[PDB]
Design a protein around this ligand. Structure first.
Ligand SMILES: CC(=O)N[C@@H]1[C@@H](O)[C@@H](O)[C@@H](CO)O[C@H]1O
Ligand SMILES: [Cl-]
Length: 253
């Protein structure tokens, strides 16, 4: 009659920061100081072409950063490790330089979310990702956490998991989750622990509500330490689902 292991709320926050747009996230952060939030921001598939993001980002990001239970990460694309590593490094360094380039201590992130990491094992690809982790851990401006997340959007070879602090090993519809027998899918992953794993479930039917939603949250908390669940089928990373506060309430329980 408990919810099992506690998980963090993972938020791919690709809502454009117009005035008020991030209010639903700030509200639940405020309501649940005991809950830990991992929040990815993404000005333009990366930090953007300049040293600093636009006026809306520069206003809103520090408001989120001001909460102790928020861990902000900068989105960086890797294009299945095919992207030139110097260009990836440029993006990491740009995020890292944000607080000093802005003279705003709170215009900063605490790590990097690497999108599109590949599933298939390859030694050269492992070396690429490990170097990227070294860059994140070693660069001023990404502290204190220097957090690293990989998003293969599917289960990668287990040898990749130790290179990141968290790996998104599920990112698909609720229907796909169900086709794969839910939490059972996570049991197939060798050399792994829930603490290394993130699950993203979108397109949840609005009928999965109340105790039905509690059940899903509990099932996923058992196997993944970071979780995003939303009932949106469209723009599920660019808006809040109709049961966003209920989802966070369950994560807090
Ligand atoms: C959970 C997550 O982050 N998914 C990414 C998202 O960041 C965005 O890049 C999207 C379209 O660009 O592609 C997905 O791979
Ligand atoms: Cl929708």
């Amino acid at each position: 009659h408990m919810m099992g292991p506690k998980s963090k709320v993972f938020v791919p926050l690709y809502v454009y920061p117009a005035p008020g747009a991030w209010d639903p996230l700030e509200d639940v952060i405020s309501k649940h100081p005991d809950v830990n939030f991992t929040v990815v921001i993404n000005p333009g598939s990366g930090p953007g072409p300049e040293a600093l993001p636009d006026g809306n980002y520069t206003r809103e990001i520090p408001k989120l950063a001001s909460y102790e239970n928020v861990r902000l990460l900068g989105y960086v694309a890797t294009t299945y490790a095919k992207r030139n590593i110097s260009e990836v490094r440029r993006d990491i360094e740009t995020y890292a330089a944000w607080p000093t380039q802005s003279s705003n201590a709170n215009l900063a992130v605490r790590g990097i979310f690497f999108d599109e990491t590949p599933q298939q094992y390859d030694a050269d690809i492992l070396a690429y990702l490990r170097e990227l982790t070294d860059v994140v851990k070693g660069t001023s401006g990404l502290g204190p956490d220097h957090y690293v997340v990989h998003n293969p959007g599917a289960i990668p070879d287990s040898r990749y998991l130790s290179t990141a602090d968290s790996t998104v090993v599920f990112e698909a519809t609720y229907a796909t989750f169900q086709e794969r027998h839910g939490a059972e899918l996570f049991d197939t992953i060798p050399d792994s622990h829930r603490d290394q794993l993130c699950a993203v479930i979108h397109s949840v039917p609005t009928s999965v509500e109340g105790s039905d939603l509690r059940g899903l949250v509990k099932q996923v908390r058992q196997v993944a330490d970071e979780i995003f669940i939303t009932h949106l089928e469209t723009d599920y990373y660019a808006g809040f689902g109709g049961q966003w506060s209920e989802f966070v309430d369950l994560m807090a329980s």
